[PDB]
Amino acid sequence: MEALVYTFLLVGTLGIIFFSIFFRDPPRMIK
C-alpha cells in the first residue's frame, strides 16, 4: 500500500510540473 501512495504522489508532482510547463497563464505582463 505504501508503494502505491509513493507512486501516486510522485505522479502527481510530475503532472503538476507538466501542467505548469505547458498550461501556464500566458506572460503578456512583460513581453
Binding site: 501512495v5 509513493y6 504522489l9 510522485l10 508532482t13 503538476i16 501542467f19 505548469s20 501556464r24 497563464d25
Partner: protein, 38 residues
C-alpha cells in the same frame, strides 16, 4: 443586517499561485510520507 460593511474585499489567486501551492503541498507530502508511515 445592520449596514453593509465597506471593508469587504475579495481574495484573488492567479494560476501561478495555484501551481505553487499544489507543488508545495505535493512535495511536502512526498518528503513526509515515508516518515509518517515509518
Amino acid at each position: 443586517m445592520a449596514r453593509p460593511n465597506p471593508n469587504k474585499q475579495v481574495v484573488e489567486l492567479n494560476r501561478t499561485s495555484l501551481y505553487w501551492g499544489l507543488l508545495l503541498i505535493f512535495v511536502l507530502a512526498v518528503l513526509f510520507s515515508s516518515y509518517i508511515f515509518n
